[PDB]
Enzyme design. Sequence first.
Site, PDB file in Angstrom:
ATOM      1  N   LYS A   1      45.225 -16.161  28.979  1.00 29.42           N
ATOM      2  CA  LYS A   1      43.550 -18.173  28.918  1.00 29.42           C
ATOM      3  C   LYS A   1      44.619 -19.347  30.228  1.00 29.42           C
ATOM      4  CE  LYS A   1      42.473 -18.241  24.274  1.00 29.42           C
ATOM      5  NZ  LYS A   1      40.915 -17.975  24.961  1.00 29.42           N
TER       6      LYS A   1
ATOM      7  N   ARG B   1      35.794 -11.422  17.781  1.00 33.66           N
ATOM      8  CA  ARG B   1      34.692 -10.176  17.852  1.00 33.66           C
ATOM      9  C   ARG B   1      35.152  -8.949  16.938  1.00 33.66           C
ATOM     10  NH1 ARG B   1      30.815 -12.087  22.586  1.00 33.66           N
ATOM     11  NH2 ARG B   1      32.822 -13.562  22.692  1.00 33.66           N
TER      12      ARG B   1
END
Lengths: 518, 518, 510
Positions: free
Chosen positions: A301, A378
């Site tokens: 990020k 996920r």
Amino acid sequence: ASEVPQVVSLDPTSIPIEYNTPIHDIKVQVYDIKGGCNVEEGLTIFLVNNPGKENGPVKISSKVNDKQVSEFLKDENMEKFNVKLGTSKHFYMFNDNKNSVAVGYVGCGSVADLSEADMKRVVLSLVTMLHDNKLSKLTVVFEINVDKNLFRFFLETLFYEYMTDERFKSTDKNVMEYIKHLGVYINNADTYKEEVEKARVYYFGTYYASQLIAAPSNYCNPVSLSNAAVELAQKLNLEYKILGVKELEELKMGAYLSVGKGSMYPNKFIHLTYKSKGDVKKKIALVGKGITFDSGGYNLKAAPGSMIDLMKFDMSGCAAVLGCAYCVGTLKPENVEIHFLSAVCENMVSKNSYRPGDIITASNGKTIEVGNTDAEGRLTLADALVYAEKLGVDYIVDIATLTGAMLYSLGTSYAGVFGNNEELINKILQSSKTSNEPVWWLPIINEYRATLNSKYADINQISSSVKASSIVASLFLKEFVQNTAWAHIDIAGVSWNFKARKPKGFGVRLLTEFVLND
Amino acid sequence: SEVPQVVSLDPTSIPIEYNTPIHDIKVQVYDIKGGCNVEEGLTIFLVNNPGKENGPVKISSKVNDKQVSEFLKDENMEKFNVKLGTSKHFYMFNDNKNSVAVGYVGCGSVADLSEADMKRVVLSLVTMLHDNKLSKLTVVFEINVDKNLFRFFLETLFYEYMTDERFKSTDKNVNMEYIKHLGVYINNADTYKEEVEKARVYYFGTYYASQLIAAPSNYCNPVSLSNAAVELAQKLNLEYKILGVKELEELKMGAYLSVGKGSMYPNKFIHLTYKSKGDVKKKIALVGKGITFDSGGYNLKAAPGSMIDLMKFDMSGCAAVLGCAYCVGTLKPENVEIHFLSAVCENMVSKNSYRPGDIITASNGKTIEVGNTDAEGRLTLADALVYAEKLGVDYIVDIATLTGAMLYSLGTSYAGVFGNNEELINKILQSSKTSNEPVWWLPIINEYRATLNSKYADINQISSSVKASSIVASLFLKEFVQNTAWAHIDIAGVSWNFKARKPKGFGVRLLTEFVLND
Amino acid sequence: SEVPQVVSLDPTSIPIEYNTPIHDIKVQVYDIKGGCNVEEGLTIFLVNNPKENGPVKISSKVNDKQVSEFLKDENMEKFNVKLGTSKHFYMFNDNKNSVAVGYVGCGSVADLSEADMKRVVLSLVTMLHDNKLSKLTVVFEINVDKNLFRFFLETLFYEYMTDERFKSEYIKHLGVYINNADTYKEEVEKARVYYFGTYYASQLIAAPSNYCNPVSLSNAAVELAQKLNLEYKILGVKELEELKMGAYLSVGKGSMYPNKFIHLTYKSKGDVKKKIALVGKGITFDSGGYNLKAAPGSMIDLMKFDMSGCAAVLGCAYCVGTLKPENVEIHFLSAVCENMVSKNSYRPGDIITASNGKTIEVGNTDAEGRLTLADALVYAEKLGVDYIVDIATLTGAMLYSLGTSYAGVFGNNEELINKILQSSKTSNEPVWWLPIINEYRATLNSKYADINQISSSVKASSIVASLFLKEFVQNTAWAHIDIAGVSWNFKARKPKGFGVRLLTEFVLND
Ligand SMILES: CC(C)C[C@H](NC(=O)[C@@H](O)[C@H](N)Cc1ccccc1)C(=O)O
Ligand SMILES: CC(C)C[C@H](NC(=O)[C@@H](O)[C@H](N)Cc1ccccc1)C(=O)O
Ligand SMILES: CC(C)C[C@H](NC(=O)[C@@H](O)[C@H](N)Cc1ccccc1)C(=O)O
Ligand SMILES: [Mg+2]
Ligand SMILES: [Mg+2]
Ligand SMILES: [Mg+2]
Ligand SMILES: [Zn+2]
Ligand SMILES: [Zn+2]
Ligand SMILES: [Zn+2]
């Protein structure tokens, strides 16, 4: 209870947690407005509105058992003030016993049913009156209509906003005294009394989640967070099992294990169980995303707006599930067995991390091609969902800070719910209504499924074409539940209160209402 | 002590040259009123023409040679001008019938040269020394210079002439030969003579810092840099101590230690001390930022313009302080005790690194919320400042490559100084003047302090809202000095000479003049 | 009015095809019960297998011995039903005539979605585009709704038609075999109508911004109304000034083309039981204005499509005018203009006054569609209608919330949103209800004007835009359909014509 590894001796080895908060010491008394209000020590605030008339005048309608205070609060004096939502005023006077009393009101506007958002505004005004004023007591007089759920929400919110988290303060503690007593005057009081202890339990589950979420990633890592869950189970008499890496390898949880490969903290999978003593009629698994820090991994990020500095909050799903465990373990619902699960790990950059392109095998044997190491939630949820379905439950509900796109779709107020079963989605929506934690139903659009087709693996982790990332995530998770009613709550947008610079503990009450009303 | 290696080819020390070719130059100063002997090598006149922009050259010195005097008549010189930094070479036979080289450097038309003007003069002189194999240079001052500017001339000549070939192997310059003699003719020679060996000392402090800075991060790491510091201290007979991790843990230096967590090199805190024999009247701590490589950490320097390839220079502060130790240790001032301090470490990406959001505890008990791992310099400085203040000194001066914003405020020529004490700031400004290392006083604006209020910790490392980052970093540092005169010199913009692709060794002469003046 | 030109080579009208080869296809539908005739052209069976990607097996009797051989189980087994897989072969029938026979895979699942039926059709169209055929026969060995059957027909017609207007063969017969064929017959001409309204919309959208500008688009709308006998009224800049449409006029300021506001009216014979205003965003090119679309991802090259709502509303006018539903009155509105960079353009920071008196602070000149719609909504509400529905390519954020398949619908009235959802079901153009979150309203509180055009803080921009639009309807049931994600078929490089069938279904139903 595992040992937390340290790099230096100054690294913390547990998350500090306050269980006995000052809110727990507050004595709450509820009285029926028909007997009149007694006005003595502390501060007495009337919640007043004026239906129709936007910014209409304040008129106090309750009987006040004091001639001086009644004179003060007469219509002639009060009409110079208005009910604008969130507006407030303080009054000082001497009562019939010649003792000075403080009184005031908060405006509740001109709309007769307050939204959850409006009530929060009323409560924030009330809290500003509590702050920077050494009070032993607060009394609140309801001259607005609230249902039982809204009354409870008022108390939960009041308790939550009033409580100040000073665990990480050292030299900068607020030299802050809390009221010892809370009086409430309301019509048909007997019918609202049962909400008081329920509100106090829901406040703590929320505040407990909040403490976990706000704890920085050096304090709250996968070992210390699973230790906190152990401690909570021991306090509530819940069963618990923490699975460590050797057992996770044995279960072939390759997706979850890959995410944690880069971390100095071993993965820990949390499994708590509540079972009712009677005949079990419903079995429920609650799954929370448990990433204690999300750097993105090799897909770091670094992009403007990626908010790497907020990423201690990526275990907010796990926190909500543990806050729910607190409420459930305390209130002890009958006829139900609930599993509280989280595949906890940290997503880091290391010689050891998984890589963009790696192909990894989930516990149900599906191979997954990693497209972006920052879609790690996920992958951990894939394996947690396979574990959960193996338990043989009626419903699986997961809750996760899964996709930034939620900020562009529903924003910071409503969570999104996706699922494979409409009866279960409607139950979640009903829980949302009775918890006053808002959620909106979003579709799993099958047309996007094809963009998860991998040239090499059984499936792609991410889409290369579809920008609807929250729906794509839901499609991916759906592949890991074969035959069970499942719903997925994406709280990426709603978990962190950006303005107030703190968590909301979002989901605790929602999930608890779900459990209780089933 | 022992430098860890990943492979056997990793270096285990910083190469350092002590006996440089400049040290072998025999320097003689003569009074100009005796006239100039022109016998050999190159003889350069420094000439200006006050008033006349690009005016003609006129050689005013008496020259003790008929042939050379004839050559240098005004008629023959009139074709040439004094434009600053302009130069010419002449060739002729002297009275002894031996060929000599003679020339001039133009010093413009403003009779008082700035430090930058003088540097331009020196660079032109240096181009005459390069690519010409000469055994002797003679410089004739036909311009006016005070003692400090004369010293600056020599220091600058020595430093610009010296070429750093430590990392050359197959590409050393086969033609570099250095002069063995420097003759200088100047008015009132006897008063300038003292400046010669002071210049040589200052040249070496500056060149030593330069060697440390230019040494890349694989040679110059916390272990090798602290080892070099010990060797320096031994050579000058300074007291020294290097504090390792266990001692740092005992001292509770949690801010400094968190920065170095992700590195393969253990933290080393350098503490050298000079103490005069006799009464000690001032005690001074000099603190240098010593990040041996600044990757940014999890907030990786990846944005365009972030200059990650230059970040071996992030120990320039520490190098200035060690250069200063060399000069002070050599010149031995009376009446002082000086502590030369640097918290040395490397800011890296690892499973072991500190993360954005981490809450850490400094050695004075303040908790700090990390908002960006790339604001690491202020964390290490925080603990170093606390350590400095415990020493019971009169002044604490820190020097640091702290904020990139310096390039936008002062740029590449002037350093910024901030401080809590106007008399100390003035001393630094005074030292800036006599060292000819330019510094400008910038404010610590207290209105921005509130932006460092943390919701959870005692203080934020970085501002949410203020873009004036050099001022914000000074506000943060100020929180770690309780009651001692302190100034902070931000050298981020001035340390590296981007045009020449080399360090300046900025701050060595500044800090030394500071110590000497006091 | 005349369209202004810079050079004599600038086009002065949008080319439109009205009569298309699709209109020349004779359509016949037959019951499957009596077997199929494979006498000529190409025959395709739509076959599934409720075994995943299992074999093809054909169940219909065919009245040709040669073709019956081809279709025997043993041969068909070599092919599979994976959704969209197809094969076809040329061969000689019983009278030694050349015929082609094939199948399209319909997968393993009983109910075909809208998206699945699109896939089936694309595969069919692939064959048609590749073959010189006079007849196509389609045999349904799968079960479909009346509505999905019509959808199959509309999609077939739309995808098969190729738009050649800017470039410098078709079957003449369509046979369909289906169970209970009599019940599907009325779907046929309704589909041909829905096809054209959709294709028309697509022609306006695909038309580049030099051809399709506020003048030539309004001229096209006039010509449409004339062919259909609708009332029409184009409001020019002087009338717009008189009506104080300052939000809309501001957006148009930087453009060489005068703003033109389109207002067509359909009125039913008989007692009018419902009045409806359908408002479409009509930005003929959206550059972003001084907030130029320069950011990576901003798709300035596609911004001719920024009048898609307008085109949906005109395509709907074609359908309504042709089908002539009763007891209803419909106004088709669009505030058309173009958003450009000029010395004359509106600026970031400007305060403008809308036709209802609300002053608006402009935070971003690229949030122009909501300004044009604000004035259009006031105008609409003055008509005294029961429902106002706008349709607009309003926010790029739709790509991130619902994506490219489903449009969003927001509104102030649940009954009306429910009716749109139902029209979505029967049109097979998917829509999902999204909330208007009132907690975000305070972020439109302007320091200086009555309201901000944009939020500074809230990133939920499709909701923010809805909250802004909501301020311009006071007392009428209203819904807003954001089609920014849905309008353009990125992969096929052409419009979808999205919203036409949705809005017509809405009008026809309620
Ligand atoms: C690669 C993408 C498809 C997925 C990616 N997901 C993530 O980064 C999650 O792991 C993040 N935890 C999502 C997130 C980002 C910002 C604020 C709140 C939540 C995202 O950008 O949302
Ligand atoms: C995160 C920011 C508020 C602070 C940050 N500071 C740093 O990166 C320091 O650690 C840098 N070493 C300072 C620097 C940056 C660029 C060129 C020369 C020097 C900076 O960007 O200036
Ligand atoms: C400034 C923002 C709040 C609004 C801005 N809106 C627009 O640009 C609209 O006018 C665009 N016509 C919407 C659009 C953008 C990208 C792809 C498809 C559609 C947007 O980019 O969403
Ligand atoms: Mg991530
Ligand atoms: Mg840095
Ligand atoms: Mg725009
Ligand atoms: Zn994550
Ligand atoms: Zn640095
Ligand atoms: Zn637009």
